[PDB]
Structure formats: structure tokens, C-alpha cells
Ligand binder design. Sequence first.
Ligand code: HEC
Ligand code: HEC
Ligand SMILES: [Co+2]
Ligand SMILES: [Co+2]
Lengths: 106, 106
Amino acid sequence: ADLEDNMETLNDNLKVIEKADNAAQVKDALTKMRAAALDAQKATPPKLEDKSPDSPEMWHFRHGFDHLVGHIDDALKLANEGKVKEAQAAAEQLKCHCNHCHQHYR
Amino acid sequence: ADLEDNMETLNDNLKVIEKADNAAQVKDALTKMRAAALDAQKATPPKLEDKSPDSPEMWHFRHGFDHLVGHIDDALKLANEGKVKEAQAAAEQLKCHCNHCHQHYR
Ligand code: HEC
Ligand code: HEC
Ligand SMILES: [Co+2]
Ligand SMILES: [Co+2]
């Protein structure tokens, strides 16, 4: 899957958590988002075509996925503790990670 | 200033920027936010006095402030371009930084 693929996965599943018909769908969507974020971290965004892999732009790009994954894991723990409403509430705050990285590089 | 007074400065000047409609007003408010953020950036907070200065938790706390200062700086540059509304949208996007650090600390 490519960067555009990974972003569709993240967008589709973030909305699944918002609209989840049952609590089990939240964990399933978080799982898919974690995979998509780790895959996206290995891509080069088009607006950073010309920059070094050691550039601060690419550093901040990759770091954003690390941090996103951290907070997805926080949400998964809540869901794995059966605290599925708390997990759904946490998942809505993930939108800040999307918005922040997009500000820079989308 | 103390932590509570710095946090109030950040809180009020966000609304100053929302209320404003010209570049000088937005720049003035962002400069105040930046000074408030730098004032609070380096102090260990009460809940982590027993944590090492290089502990994962202190590291993430300090990065919260470093990253907030970075985006205030970016918004300030937009205001210095006369891009009032882009500067205002960036300032609204700062709320993600506020809530992220709060949820970690509280
Ligand atoms: C950086 C660390 C990012 C994080 C975190 C998220 N996204 Fe993203 N996204 C990023 C870039 C650089 C781009 C541009 C990709 C390109 O090839 O142009 C995107 C794009 C999207 C898109 C549009 C995809 C497309 O086909 O054009 C969507 C729908 C999207 N992103 C959604 C999304 C969501 C919901 C996120 C949080 C869960 C998220 N992204 C995180 C960089 C980064
Ligand atoms: C850590 C990296 C922080 C960032 C970034 C921001 N804040 Fe904060 N805030 C932080 C602490 C440790 C505290 C004190 C402990 C607590 O949880 O209250 C605060 C407190 C505030 C308050 C007062 C809370 C109240 O009940 O009135 C406000 C109003 C506040 N903070 C505002 C604020 C804003 C607007 C921020 C972004 C621009 C912001 N804070 C960032 C830690 C951190
Ligand atoms: Co965090
Ligand atoms: Co940033």
C-alpha cells in the first residue's frame, strides 16, 4: 500500500470509531489505523520529494507517526480493558494528529 | 511568572486572536503567548518532580512546550506576512497542543 492508501485507511477507520455500531468495531479500527500509520511512516510525502531523509522536515514527518501510534496504543489499552467508551473518546482526539501533520506536509 | 499565570496568558490570548481582525492585533497576541510558553517551558511540574530529567515522561512534557513554541513561531510568521486569517487558523490549531499536554498530565 502507498501513502494515499494508508491515508484512506486512517480516514475510513477514524470515522468507523465515530460511527461504530458496536464496541468491538472500535478495537478493530484502531488496529487497522496502527498498521496504516507504521506503513505511512516509511513513505515520502510529495511535498517533501526534494528533501534529505535526514532533513528536519522528514524527521518531524516520521516522528508524527510515532506519536500517533503511541496514542493509538493508549486507545487500544482502554478498549482492551473493556473501557470502550473511553477508547472511543480517546480516538476522537487522534484527529489533532491528523490535523497537525497535514498542516505541515499535506 | 508562575505556571498558572502563564497558562492564563495562553488561554486569554487565544481568544484575543479569535476576536481580532488585523495583523498587528494577532502578532501582538502571539508574541505574548510565545513569551508565556517560554516562561513555562523549562520547569519540572509538580507531578514529575520525582522523575528523572531524561525520563520518557519529562521528555514528552518538555517536547509539548517546545512543539507549542514552534507553532506559535509559525503562526507569528504568517501574521508578519499580513496573512491575518491564516494566522488565526493556525492559532486555533494550537488548541490541540493545549489539550494533548493536559490529558497527559491530568
Ligand atoms: C504525518 C505524520 C501524518 C499524519 C499523522 C496523518 N497524515 Fe494524512 N496525510 C499526510 C500527508 C503528507 C498527506 C498527503 C499525501 C499525498 O500523497 O498527497 C496526507 C493525506 C491524507 C489524506 C488525503 C489522501 C489522498 O488520497 O490524497 C487523507 C484523507 C488523510 N491524510 C487522512 C488522515 C487522517 C484521518 C489522519 C489521522 C488519523 C492522518 N491522515 C494522519 C500526513 C499525515
Ligand atoms: C504541557 C506541555 C502543557 C501545554 C502545551 C499547555 N499546558 Fe496548560 N497546563 C499545563 C499544566 C501542568 C497545568 C497545571 C495543572 C492542571 O492540569 O491544571 C496547566 C493548566 C492550565 C490552565 C488552568 C486550568 C484551570 O482549571 O483553569 C489553563 C487555563 C491552561 N493550562 C491553558 C492552556 C492553553 C490555552 C494551552 C495552549 C495554548 C496550554 N495550556 C498548553 C500544561 C500544559
Ligand atoms: Co502524547
Ligand atoms: Co509540528
